[PDB]
Swiss-Prot record, chains A, B:
It is an enzyme of class 4 (lyase). It comes from Bdellovibrio bacteriovorus (strain ATCC 15356 / DSM 50701 / NCIMB 9529 / HD100). One of its GO terms (biological process) is menaquinone biosynthetic process. This is o-succinylbenzoate synthase. Mg(2+) binds at residues 143, 172, 194.
Amino acid sequence: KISYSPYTLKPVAREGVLLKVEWNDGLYGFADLHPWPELGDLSLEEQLSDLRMGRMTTQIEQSIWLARRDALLRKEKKHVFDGGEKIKNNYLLSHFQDLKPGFLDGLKNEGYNTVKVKMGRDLQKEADMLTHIAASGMRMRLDFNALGSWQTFEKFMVNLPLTVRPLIEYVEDPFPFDFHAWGEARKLAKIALDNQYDKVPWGKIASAPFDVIVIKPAKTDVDKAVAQCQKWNLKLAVTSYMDHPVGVVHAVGVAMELKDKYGDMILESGCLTHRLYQMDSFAAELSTQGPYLLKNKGTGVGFDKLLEALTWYQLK
Amino acid sequence: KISYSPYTLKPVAREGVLLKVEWNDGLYGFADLHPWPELGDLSLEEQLSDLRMGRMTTQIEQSIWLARRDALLRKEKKHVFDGGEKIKNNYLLSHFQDLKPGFLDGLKNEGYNTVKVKMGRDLQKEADMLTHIAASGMRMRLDFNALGSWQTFEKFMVNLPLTVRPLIEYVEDPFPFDFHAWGEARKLAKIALDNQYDKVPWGKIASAPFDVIVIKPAKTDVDKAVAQCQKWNLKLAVTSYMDHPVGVVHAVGVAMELKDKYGDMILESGCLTHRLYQMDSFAAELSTQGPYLLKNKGTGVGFDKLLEALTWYQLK
Ligand SMILES: [Mg+2]
Ligand SMILES: [Mg+2]
């Protein structure tokens, strides 16, 4: 059985649904389904429409996989955080905010070590921002969302201040995937595979033309990504999907489990994104300590009372 | 001659008295006297006792000044709002009240621009409240009531998110007045001078170590405050005194007069506090339109029939 409860999130609007899944063994769990058509996903309406037709998107498959984890935990009355190792999240910096002097010091004192920055609009401006971050001694993650090009990327990197270069943990999707271009880009900085993941022919590559695999539990087959990481001796970073609090707790839960199991193979995550939306009933139950998402009350991903209080509509 | 009518206000129990003042020219007017011993005022009993013996607190002097304004208007058959420029008030948020999703968004849609928050109880509990205010895009006024410290205050400000910082209109009495400490505090945020007003050696300072002077018509010498604001090119904010509806209307009347006269020198007000108490006959006659206090029926501050219906006891 699959049932849903719709919701809308307002950026500081987006539509998604929470899912309640029930199995034969009498277990039931919860998960989130939050499509990002802007990133290439089928819309919420289309994914659910397709589901009725019998086809399940990989994103829905992940929602089910997550709901199962939640189900087993609620059964044994444990929280997804239990058994896992705490992990720090990076701070996402939006260039639509005037970096007040001393702010970086504000983040660092509270525990933050890394800042993720969207790159692409203005390289000059962005370069100046990276210099400020480097000046504070913090590490950084550059995300080009595959908009750049091999040439522009090279010129950009080579000309960055000597203080910046060492503090760039990695560059996500520098430009559209190309085996040779990515392989050569590695000479300038560690390269991370995020939105270009589906472009890699895993059963054909002779080696991995990247250093990090970004795993988003909401969309990525976790076991397969971990397998690839171990096969090629890479590192992995777990992120949320700018989704619902339920999706966020699920993501952190996965990250903490991986950190406990694989230690140094797991880098800091990027799941602290619930603050990107205006408070809803669920977000109200979440608390943070700097780069850490604290354990919320309840079992599974928590929100026991809130989830139990919802009217769930039969889906499939 | 001065006469009074006692009253109690019950928070959502405070004692105060309305005053009926008569002049040799035959005019008579009304005002409120509502002490806040919790804020340093002498008690109602003590102020009235001192009055009978020949001394008026500045608060009583203000009540008289207000009663005269009311008397003049009742003679002309005009309301205190007439000729003034309407002014927006901030919303006073309580920490003992849980925010509900969409509430702040709702206020913003009705015209509200700012939220006032009392700080001091719990910085964290309060800091999270500021994030929600920021998330709604509203400005905020923080009132520390001079309980902090130069040190305890600096730690706080630098930690506020890049979304919050630019949304802080100003901080009222961040800590006990000190010229140097306050001057340096201005670097972290604009500072408003409220309850520490009397600690400033006016005709002795070389410059003003604050950005805003808060005027409470119930106890501040208005002309004197305006003069200092003009002398140091500051800004002023007019507020009520968590007092009787009579006091509230009087305060808004002053704010509208100042706004019409000094325009941009006057910031949004903080007089919409009648809902802080359980309904009484006077509050029943007040209406609002979002952040605006609407013109109530009558002359002077209004409430003509209500005031005329009370039995007044001779005081002095
Ligand atoms: Mg990315
Ligand atoms: Mg104050």
